[PDB]
Paper text:
We crystallized PRL3 C104A with the fragment of CNNM3 that had previously been used to study the complex with PRL25. The structure of PRL3 with the CNNM3 CBS-pair domain is the first crystal structure of PRL3. As observed in previous PRL•CNNM complexes, the CBS-pair domain forms a homodimer in a head-to-head orientation with each CBS-pair domain binding one phosphatase molecule. Within the phosphatase active site, arginine 110 (numbered as in PRL3) provides the positive charge necessary for binding the CNNM aspartic acid residue. Outside of the active site, arginine 138 and leucine 108 mediate conserved electrostatic and hydrophobic interactions. Crystal structures of PRL3 (C104A), and the oxidized forms of PRL2 and PRL1 all show a deep pocket which is closed off in the complex with reduced PRL2.
Recent reports have shown PRL phosphatases bind tightly to the CNNM family of membrane proteins to regulate magnesium efflux. We report four new crystal structures of PRL proteins bound to the CNNM3 CBS-pair domain that reveal the effects of cysteine disulphide formation and nucleotide binding on complex formation.
Numbering used by the authors:
A (entry chain D): 298 to 422, 425 to 446
B (entry chain C): 5 to 158
C (entry chain B): 298 to 446
D (entry chain A): 5 to 159
């Protein structure tokens, strides 16, 4: 417990997002042009994610976040694309950089923002471009403390 | 990797730095142009998407291409500054869209030396752009841009 | 950040469940005899809870836990009472006492136990048989909140 | 709020402390009695439930009521000790169930002075019960329980 946890809390100041993220291939995610039938609904139900990144076309192109609580009053008879459902509600995209300190992302985390932040690195190896690596969650940091 | 449109207001001038869209993502690309009140897009990258839907909806698209991570050639900067003042003359209020590939490069550069031409100090140009969009200009183009100086054309 | 947090981790060992708990009147809960039509489904959806205590009769009488992921495959106009859905899957109830230290509850959570524990106290006023007395629910996030603030 | 049945083994005598059921909840209440191998229940609270299903399943229910959180009157104690001694004779192995309202009161008390009567020392009796059910005896039934003296009556 507590001694492990205390230095966890202070190596918040030394670990970057780039050590505790989920890289983008293993992240639960949805194409916008996907459509609420009962099966997509169900697979989201037992996915056990409550907030899912919504991309168009390519996965490294996140346009929105779907909340579980959002699809409470969409009916799935109705075959409605997630594209539309996702700006029924403007949900925040939280963007953060690879070399951001973990405690800073934490401070960010309960400064209200979405508990899922998405990770960018700049790349220069030509115009510089941002480069999506994956997602970090508040629980990724939480576990960095409590283990 | 393509980031969301970013507005830069200064002067009572308003630029929107954007990514290059696809023809698939084109509807939404037009739609943030009309949200931001852009009536003019300046493309400076390769031609990828068809321009006729956009001026169908009343947005002029201007093709002034110069190459990947190069500074603007002199023709391009002069045309840029003059288009900018003409459009902000024609209606005060509106936005000019600029985009290259991913809005982290040449288009921020043109916004930048527009700002310097407005008589914002240089590193307050870079200042202002890098706060909203981190790590935007590369090598050669900020080397370019301090050896740039304004005869205040705006 | 970290000084507050290190201090959280330190009095994890002296703060008890009883004030970081949600007392029972504020908790999201369901009568067993309630029935999955689409509206109750929707109300659980937008409840934003993934784990809900199911009580019979009185609220201080928790019989099961409904999981959100459980109702993935019930069809809700096939309108079936929550009692039976909750006997499709018995999910174990986690019971804990008030004067339990927070780090101990942390350990209880930290392999397998439901992230929802229910809180009971013994009571000795006045004379009769002592009885257990439900106060409310504690979540793992009630404790997390005690560290990260 | 009624907690789950708890077994107290020592000596090779075996007690199960339970709640008073309602008998909407009876089938399951019988079921933990035969899982624990109780063939005899001692109730000491109000009669709320019908014993005859339990009698038909071969479990004798014995009604020896005394008041809420009072110590056992002396007749009740002697009967308790003698019933216990007779039952663990009749088969070694089996359980005796005792319950009042919620198993945190009189029933732990009778388990307790059964334990003392077997010659476990008192403080070990209490704290043995209190290991398994938190905060079990009230004050006067503890005041009762060591001006009590065992004269040996269980092996």
């Amino acid at each position: 417990g507590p001694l492990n946890m205390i230095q966890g809390v202070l190596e918040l100041r030394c670990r970057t997002v780039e050590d505790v993220l989920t890289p983008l291939e293993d992240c639960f995610m949805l194409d916008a042009s996907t459509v609420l039938d009962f099966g997509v609904l169900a697979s989201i139900m037992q996915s056990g994610h409550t907030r899912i990144p919504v991309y168009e076309e390519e996965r490294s192109n996140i346009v929105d976040m779907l909340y579980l609580k959002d699809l409470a009053f969409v009916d799935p008879e109705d075959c409605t694309p997630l594209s539309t459902i996702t700006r029924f509600y403007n949900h925040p995209l939280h963007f953060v950089f690879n070399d951001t300190k973990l405690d800073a992302v934490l401070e960010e985390f309960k400064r209200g923002k979405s508990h899922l932040a998405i990770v960018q690195k700049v790349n220069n190896e030509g115009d510089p471009f941002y480069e999506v690596l994956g997602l970090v969650t508040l629980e990724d940091v939480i576990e960095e403390i409590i283990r | 990797n393509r980031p969301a449109p970013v507005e830069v207001s200064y002067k009572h001038m308003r630029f929107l730095i954007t990514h290059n869209p696809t023809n698939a993502t084109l509807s939404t690309f037009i739609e943030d142009l009309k949200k931001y009140g852009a009536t003019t897009v300046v493309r400076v990258c390769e031609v990828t998407y068809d321009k006729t839907p956009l001026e169908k909806d009343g947005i002029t698209v201007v093709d002034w291409p110069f190459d990947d991570g190069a500074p603007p050639p002199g023709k391009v900067v002069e045309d840029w500054l003059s288009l900018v003042k003409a459009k902000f003359c024609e209606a005060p209020g509106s936005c000019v869209a600029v985009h290259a590939v991913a809005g982290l490069g040449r288009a921020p550069v043109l916004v930048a030396l527009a700002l310097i031409e407005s008589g914002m100090k240089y590193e307050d140009a870079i200042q202002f752009i890098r706060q909203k969009r981190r790590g935007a200009i590369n090598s050669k183009q900020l080397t370019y841009l301090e050896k740039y100086r304004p005869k205040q054309r705006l």
